Amino acid sequence: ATLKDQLIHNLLKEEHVPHNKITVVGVGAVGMACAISILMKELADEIALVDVMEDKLKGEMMDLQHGSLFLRTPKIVSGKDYNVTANSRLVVITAGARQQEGESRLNLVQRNVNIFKFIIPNIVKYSPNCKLLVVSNPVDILTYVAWKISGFPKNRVIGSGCNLDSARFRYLMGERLGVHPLSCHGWILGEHGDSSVPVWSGVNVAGVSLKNLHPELGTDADKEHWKAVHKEVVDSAYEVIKLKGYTSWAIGLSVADLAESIMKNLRRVHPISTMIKGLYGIKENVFLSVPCILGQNGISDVVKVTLTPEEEAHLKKSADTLWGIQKELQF
Amino acid sequence: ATLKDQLIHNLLKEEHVPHNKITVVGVGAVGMACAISILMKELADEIALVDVMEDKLKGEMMDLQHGSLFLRTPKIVSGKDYNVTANSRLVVITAGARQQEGESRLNLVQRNVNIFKFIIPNIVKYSPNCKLLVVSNPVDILTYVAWKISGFPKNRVIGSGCNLDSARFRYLMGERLGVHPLSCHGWILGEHGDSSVPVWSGVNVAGVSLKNLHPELGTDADKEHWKAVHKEVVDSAYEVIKLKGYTSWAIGLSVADLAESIMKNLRRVHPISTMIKGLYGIKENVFLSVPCILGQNGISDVVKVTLTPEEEAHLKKSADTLWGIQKELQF
Amino acid sequence: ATLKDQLIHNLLKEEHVPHNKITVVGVGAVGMACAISILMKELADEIALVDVMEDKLKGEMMDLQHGSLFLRTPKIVSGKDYNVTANSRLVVITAGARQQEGESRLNLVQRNVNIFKFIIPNIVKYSPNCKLLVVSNPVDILTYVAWKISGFPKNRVIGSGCNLDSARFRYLMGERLGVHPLSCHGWILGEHGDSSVPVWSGVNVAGVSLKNLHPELGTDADKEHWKAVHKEVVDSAYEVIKLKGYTSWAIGLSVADLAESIMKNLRRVHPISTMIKGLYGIKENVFLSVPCILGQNGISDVVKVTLTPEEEAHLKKSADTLWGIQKELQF
Amino acid sequence: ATLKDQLIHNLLKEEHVPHNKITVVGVGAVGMACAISILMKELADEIALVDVMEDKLKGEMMDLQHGSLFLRTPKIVSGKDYNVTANSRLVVITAGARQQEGESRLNLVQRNVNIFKFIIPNIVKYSPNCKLLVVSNPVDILTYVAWKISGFPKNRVIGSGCNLDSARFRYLMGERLGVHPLSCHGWILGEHGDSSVPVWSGVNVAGVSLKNLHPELGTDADKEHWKAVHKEVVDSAYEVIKLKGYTSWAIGLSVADLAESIMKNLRRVHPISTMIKGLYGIKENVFLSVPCILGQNGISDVVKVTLTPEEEAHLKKSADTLWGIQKELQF
């Protein structure tokens, strides 16, 4: 004689298992900006939230659930134990220490490497066949770290990489040309940091190479100082951090972007961190951003950008900076 | 080396298996309406189209394929064959004859049962676990036929029903009260045809019962003629058929709504066709629309709506009307 | 010639005037939640952000601007100034103090009225025709203050109200019955706070009245404790504040829903804060939530819900509770 | 004592005027594929349908309205008199005679020029400040025709042009490279017909010019026959027409694309028909496809593609073919 029973006549029961589950590790600025972005884009039927902060974790779960009416993701769960993570198609990693004002992402390696040695084994135990998306900084170094501990194939370990760096670039080009960013094509390759390489030789609007029209564009001295557009891409993190304390909206938006190409299997090209041994005459185990076709299996192919010698030389420079760190860890 | 081999460095092969595959059976006015509507709502990662008319088929496929840039469903395929439908989560059957001007949907029964006798075993064999969504008319009777041939549990054999008739009802109510269809609540149960029941005991705007404010509302011969709204619902198909020859945009929207609740496992309540033996004093195996909770497994529950004696009377005469045609068992 | 002049041939200048401009006043947790949610629903063609904290402001703007590639709102601007808010169709005011742990929203009244005294005339002067959406707490009392200072007709001064509390109610009901919030109907009217009224006379699933099946439902001391659901609604804010310190994702969703009905002129019914003098025996100028029909002009109509004697009693004590604080007229 | 009056307490009245109205002239295959696409993308708050076929017109209006529940465009209107069109932001023209099997779009000029002399004056009378989007064939010639009769500025008269041709191209490239079309950049310029020019010199994936890697790509004799990809772009219309009778889905999708860049003012680059006198050393009044930045004022800028002499020569050839027709009309 329960209200339920007078109302509803049961046929079936509580199957459980999700088809499109996504986990978000870390429910801080970035982790909830990832979460909100991915929920608004309707990519998951089940989202799992994990953090060591219990109170914060349950509190943000409840604020997302209160919003159920307006969403199309009917199961929102969270916990400290990784069992909640079970059978995730994708695991977004956002946990760890963040940059203080004027702090290099490279300073974070000791503290975040200790976080990863802890969580990687726990997430691979419950989801042996997930696509790992690393966001935590220094993201190129942590993506290697996840690869190294997880034991996964190089395709299922992705670092968010220069997806963000190239969106700010497009945005800055777009404002000089008076064209929407979607329409200015420009690649920011290498490290998601101070050593990123702009590929000047490939920047274009509607198939036209801005460097054939303006040979002075890029890695020099004279101009309309296009070079400073790469430099604001490099200082953009520092400046936003100095102004609000941290960055969150643009990375959350750039993670939903990748997460749509993985979940829908579109095979779109994105500058993301992947293993590059055997490609630019880089003979080591470096992870840095290259254009990669991203799908349901992760990184299925890498695009061999034609790079000039100025360009190819700042990419080797970015890749050495980076293995100078990586070699000292080996956990 | 191909231009392909120069441009792209391959890291994997693998088994391209669909996660959210939708099959549309019959590429006519209703099929393509369903198809476009499902593609614009980005519910599938692969859509498969089957039809007997080989040319029509290829043509609709190519037209949809050339709009690929504007969609997020990477794989669009067809065949006469059914090998192309494998591992579908849902299959929408729109194949068959439709009404000529002034023709009852019950009159198509004989021709459509003949095609269901061949299509169901070809479907049931290649997607053992799909949800069958029956749109072909008379929808109630083909849903029962589909069930019967398939061997599937009832949870997984859904007729499109009064989802559409309720939408039309809400629209019309909407007009009169000066509020969007979304804020006008009300259900059309029973046959998706001339015998459908308006449930005036339940029509409301914000929780207030219109039958409580105006006791003469509807199945009353008295003053503002709310009853003429139900006659417009009944008549609406006949009327669009006399003006454009067929109906398509409303039912393609109506099917993608449904499709949405199933793929995302929403657990929303839809007036759809299901087996109502046991409920509302119905002793025969007939299919008709009753409010059902829809999810990744099909109908998991039926809501027991509390009908007035006159509304129950009218539902029973609706099941009595379908059973009369249903003793023909030509399969 | 610039690279710009070589690449692009200009055909026009013109007056870039916004058609769907939205202003968010206050770039705190609630403001940015509202902002991202409105940007992902692509409701505006230009969004303007105003705050007194100059750095925070620039920072949030730049973060949102760097995600431009992933949005469809081409112009994102800010200023401390209010010249930036010109010709807005809607303005969302989220500026002010929020609750500390265990603090009543009524306690912020004094501090928020002091800021409304400066912000309203700066808003009212540059968008003579905008719709004002008040989110700042106590929302009911600031909506009345906003009205009073502005000189605007009541149609165009909206408090966010119980839209949120109804969402939370539907969520909780949802859980218990095993259906999505969207198919559970029910309203929280009165104060957006401790005095809110559950309208149990109207809670339904598919037109059936839960109070009809279970007469003991709610404002009854009897058996399954549906009344504890209302206490969780009342308590939910306090509880997320004790766990994460503030609430933000639910109200940003809740505001974009509202925003949607206004920009598209949907004529949907939302429980929002409006002037209820005349209705339900209310003799004083108080603002509280009642079901309202929302459109391009603001509130065009109020639905007269038929309250049980105990529900009316409770609404009146809710207006009696707001009026007690409302005789303070410090403006 | 009407139901309405007991239910709703009126505050305001029936303002009317829309903010985002779109008209669709012609409710045939293309016109309703435009309509459905534009409604699903939620671009208008008001859609106006116009046709001389009265029955068909009212019938498709009703099928769209029946679908109101599932849409976010609350006013759907239609008529034979142009008064319904009043104060449209955008007017999509799809009316006219279509290609029979093996028929050139150039054969349609006599019959469609008579349609335009009739409707242009009627649409400019009611919407003096609309953006005209011509879809009817031969679209380059009709866009000139609308320009010439309307008296409008060259920015507010757009022909759908090679937006479709470039999407099929991207699609065909995408299938050879195994990359999503969104990621293969390739421009189809000139006439939306048999004389279209592929700009081989600008085709790329992630900033890399396929012609520097494969100099043989394009307008020759030897290869992997990339040249046949342009040729299937040219025969694609004929083949779909031969298979289903006409084309509709891809153009409807490509019209919603342009219509979003106009309505949201994104300033995106699109290959569309515009006046090109004074640009490729073309000294006459030709309308053909060029990359143009499209916004709320229409075509605000044209992008000066760097073209090779093979390329620049097929573009002059396309532009002469076209003015050989145009010069014989002069109405």
Ligand SMILES: NC(=O)c1ccc[n+]([C@@H]2O[C@H](COP(=O)([O-])OP(=O)(O)OC[C@H]3O[C@@H](n4cnc5c(N)ncnc54)[C@H](O)[C@@H]3O)[C@@H](O)[C@H]2O)c1
């Ligand atoms: N890759 C990119 O572009 C990008 C961009 C911006 C931010 N960042 C990075 O994102 C990371 C997070 O920044 P943020 O603002 O959200 O930080 P935050 O302080 O707001 O949140 C970090 C979260 O990590 C959690 N955490 C710590 N140990 C954990 C463990 N074992 N398991 C789960 N969670 C744990 C915390 O409790 C905290 O809630 C930083 O490393 C940062 O530099 C990356």
Ligand SMILES: NC(=O)c1ccc[n+]([C@@H]2O[C@H](COP(=O)([O-])OP(=O)(O)OC[C@H]3O[C@@H](n4cnc5c(N)ncnc54)[C@H](O)[C@@H]3O)[C@@H](O)[C@H]2O)c1
């Ligand atoms: N349930 C609803 O509300 C409702 C709404 C509208 C229409 N319908 C029904 O939709 C069905 C289809 O309507 P329609 O306008 O698209 O008809 P249509 O003639 O446009 O298309 C029907 C198609 O079915 C295909 N078909 C026939 N037999 C087949 C077989 N064995 N295998 C594969 N394909 C086969 C045809 O070849 C044709 O392409 C009709 O039965 C109609 O009455 C139902």
Ligand SMILES: NC(=O)c1ccc[n+]([C@@H]2O[C@H](COP(=O)([O-])OP(=O)(O)OC[C@H]3O[C@@H](n4cnc5c(N)ncnc54)[C@H](O)[C@@H]3O)[C@@H](O)[C@H]2O)c1
């Ligand atoms: N109505 C609802 O349901 C509800 C929901 C949640 C929160 N709120 C209310 O939202 C309001 C904002 O909450 P919050 O978390 O974002 O606070 P917050 O402190 O995060 O941000 C408040 C912001 O207001 C700005 N501000 C203060 N005075 C201003 C002025 N004169 N001009 C411009 N900006 C000014 C601040 O500088 C700060 O950026 C609080 O009053 C809170 O109680 C309402």
Ligand SMILES: NC(=O)c1ccc[n+]([C@@H]2O[C@H](COP(=O)([O-])OP(=O)(O)OC[C@H]3O[C@@H](n4cnc5c(N)ncnc54)[C@H](O)[C@@H]3O)[C@@H](O)[C@H]2O)c1
């Ligand atoms: N530009 C492109 O890529 C493109 C692509 C494909 C189709 N086409 C064109 O679109 C046009 C329409 O093709 P379709 O399949 O929809 O044709 P259709 O036969 O289905 O419909 C044409 C509509 O034009 C209407 N019409 C005729 N005179 C009219 C008048 N004064 N006012 C309003 N409507 C009038 C008709 O009544 C008919 O409903 C053709 O010219 C065709 O070649 C353009």
